[model samples]
Target chain A: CIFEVKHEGKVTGYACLVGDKVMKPAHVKGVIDNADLAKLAFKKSSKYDLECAQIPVHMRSDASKYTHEKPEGHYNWHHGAVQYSGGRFTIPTGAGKPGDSGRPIFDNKGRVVAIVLGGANEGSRTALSVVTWNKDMVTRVTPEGSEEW
Target chain B: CIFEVKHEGKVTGYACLVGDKVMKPAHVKGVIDNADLAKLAFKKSSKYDLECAQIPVHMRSDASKYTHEKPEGHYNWHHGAVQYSGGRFTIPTGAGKPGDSGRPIFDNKGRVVAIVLGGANEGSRTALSVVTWNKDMVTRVTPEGSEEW
Candidate 1:
């Protein structure tokens, strides 16, 4: 999850790094993302053995033929059936459990393709917020001296 | 804008009915929406002469070659250049102004096609969140005795 703590509903701070098993208690200080890694630190903070990797910024494929991966936990990679449409993608709700929002979605090559925004289709499907549309937001480096984590 | 007041960032309350002139001090509400209108009461409260209309649940069109309407104000009818993609639609950002979110996007026949989600493409284009994706949430009758305004 892109964890943000709120006093009430107001976002007080963002946890740029969240754990695979438990999303709370952000491990790192920063906004919800950093552009340098092209991947949020969430996957980096994973205690799991397999470090999720992403395809090159220019090469992440959006094709339907490629099977996507949604890793729920260590050694628990779930095959995500992805359907792309309307500048977004959809996967079966089973691909994730509750509190799985903001997880990176990877293509067959273990490259990041999309990020989970939230649910859709009466929660029957997970709506994907595509990455390529705003690639810089995911890949741009943090400005010098302004780094939090 | 789906106007909400926040003491800090937490939503204190929702303004179910917002204005075309200025989207503040939500007119009346229990929450941000009502089921009876099949329409958010925004258009009903329009200070404009032309009351916007929508199609029957089964009649809203999602087709190419059909012109769409995006009314920015009572007298200002802008011919929105809309393009459908990725389970959503895109229109030039010129179709709306700053603070014009939550306004309806209409099909050629004067039926709502989508609702303005927000800007895309670095604000050059506006992304549309389609309405039909969750029609029940739009058309379901507000439960009796729970009505506000």
Candidate 2:
């Protein structure tokens, strides 16, 4: 039930948020986790609905900075000056870690918006992207019994 | 304008189909891109609704080959023995080039599903993720004259 998304003998990303319900991310990838640890991760969720098999991806204003504060939707992180583009990015054989890929990213609102793949930088930090196929990839799944995202 | 999101000095992702107009992913990070190139990208969509600034992502059955056949929904691509989970994924670095981020991915329909932030491949492949904060990242844009995603 737990696994890692490996890239050439290296650990890239561990599983973050996955569900057993319909109308979810099909053909999606990631996760470097154990179930018990995942359960603990769930405590940092919106509703903390523990019945579902949920994996919460909490973002930090500063990746290197660890916090004891309970995970919530509001994190007043300083915004960086980045322009928007419809182009591709990243270096070959990245300068970061494989676990950096397939990670979750939050925008200003701190909502889980994107899955990290590779690093464009020489250090750590996951890049988030906008989802255009929200309707195509996943539709309306009735978040009934033990369902998680 | 468009931009790429770089973290820890690495470029990992690009600004994509996101936003609820304004007051969204601001400063957090990225680059600006061309509208024409974005238009060409949109040409690959199922139903080209030009005025909406939409781009369609096309997925391949055989990740190693490309096809000219117009894309559509409903593909019975052999379900591989892949398991599902919610964790991070990727190489310690990456095998793909830096310009591989911020791309689009289509899992089922020839529609924009997820943005290719980076990769989780041990060899060569694009790793895709869902955009949960799509409505929060981007939405209801008045594609007037110079505005583009």
Candidate 3:
């Protein structure tokens, strides 16, 4: 029997194109689950090299609903957050409106690190929900079971 | 009756907007006759700002007679009597096909001085005819003789 791997909500890494029919329909086989397979998949890195640097973040006028003063072109830095570094970059204003989903979070290097799913307006800063990159998880999956297929 | 100044085909000066009932309807009522006014009115200077500046020209390959080197980017600029300024500011080539025209000449302040109507050849830097700005001639005709009106 052959096995395939899927991570997060997509097929990240796949084993050799196996001819086995029974394993073909399986969501995930061998040791990795859907989430694990997703994390192990080879994710696209940013085209441009990015470093953790402070950059300006602009805010719209409607942002006043969360804070007294709207922050336009404010500068901030990315710490050791890998997902935040690889996802798309966006100025956090609250959770964002209905259509703001899937916005890219860019790292200082201008590389997208994460996608903004949603957020909430906190006292000073907004609480955000993001799909970040977990390097450790991505390294777990291999080509052939444990071997690098 | 309010008399406005007008020039015949030759003279390019203001003309009186005389109604039909006037002595010479549709006739130039300036100091000179219609023929002289037409000649004087038509006397226009070249719109080229710098007399020394060579006007940019273009030529296209005759596909029917001779095949253009495939891959349009391979075409090169042909040198002619006019000295083309080389270096970083050199004009880009392959801007258009055969019979293509270059941009109009502009004055120092960026106002259009003259338009290059046509050129001689792809390799020839000779311009066939150029329609220049006639400062003395009124470009637009209005009901009122005033420029703003």
Candidate 4:
């Protein structure tokens, strides 16, 4: 599900991991599916899981680069120092449609969250997104104290 | 437009008045078309004018029974207890057809107030409905009161 959540709509261009040492990696789309996929694939999983529904999924639109940037001395919620920098990005509005339906969203843990339900443009990298589901949802769906994997 | 509001998914049922007696004697489906139909068909004519867009309506699989048992307890906030009955009910998802959409919601004066967009199921009955527009929306949409009618 995390993979699905991460790559639901956008095709990944590159991925890498940082630790004591860094390794150069080739550009490639990440894994596409995993156990979490089943939980989000069905609506019934949402029942009895309040956390799954309440988690906030921030939205971004490539258009923000032009429309949201502040020229004067100020902070921009859309794109600023406190703004989220790492998280999966996906195409809005399903895989190949218009609208912001399936755009990738992320959580504070740098994990993929939900999909954007609405508001995005074409051919531009944007961030208007919605949370599809995150680790919390997985935890809720799993039995108490059970590992989701 | 008043007729349309009455006919569209607004109002649980239409009431008829004979002299001073008000009675909701029939159930109407689809949107009300004109004032003649509203005046003749419904038992009680609304005191305020209505518009088709203002009417609130939603879909329901079963008829909503009068849950409030006490007539004296009718005046409360939006979610307050009226006669200490069950909570308000909401329209089901499969309610009304595609073009007709959901039902219209109203204010105390029987004026069209909003059109519900989503709802929740409460036991056998569903409630927790969302509306497209409300009094606040009305104020914002027509600041000059030009659209008061």
Best by lDDT: 1
* Candidate 3 docking DockQ: 0.01
lDDT of 1 by residue, A1-149 (tens): 23343434444333222112212223322333334333433344233111233333432233122123323211111333454434445555566543343345444234444444334443555553322223322321111222111
Separate DockQ for every predicted complex: 0.01, 0.02, 0.01, 0.01
Q: Per-residue lDDT of A1-149 in model 4, one digit per residue for the tens? A: 11222345664321111111111111122332333222332222333221121111221111111111112111111111111223423221223233222223332123233333333333433333333233323221121221111
Give Cα-based local distance difference scores for all models: 0.34, 0.28, 0.24, 0.25
B22-140 in candidate 2: lDDT tens per residue? Answer: 11122233322434323342221212111123333331121221122212211111111111113222222233344544443322223333333333433332232222224223221
* Residue A99 lDDT in candidate 3: 30
**Which stretches of model 2 miss by more than 4 angstroms?**
A1-11, A18-32, A36-83, A87-95, A119-133, A136-149, B1-149
Sorted into a CAPRI-style docking class, model 1 comes out as: incorrect
Cα deviation in Å at residue B12, candidate 4? 14
Angstrom error at residue B76, model 2: 42
Model 3 Cα shift for residue A4 (angstroms): 29
TM-score of 3: 0.18
Better of 2 and 4 by TM-score: 2
What would the TM-scores of all predictions be?
Answer: 0.22, 0.22, 0.18, 0.21
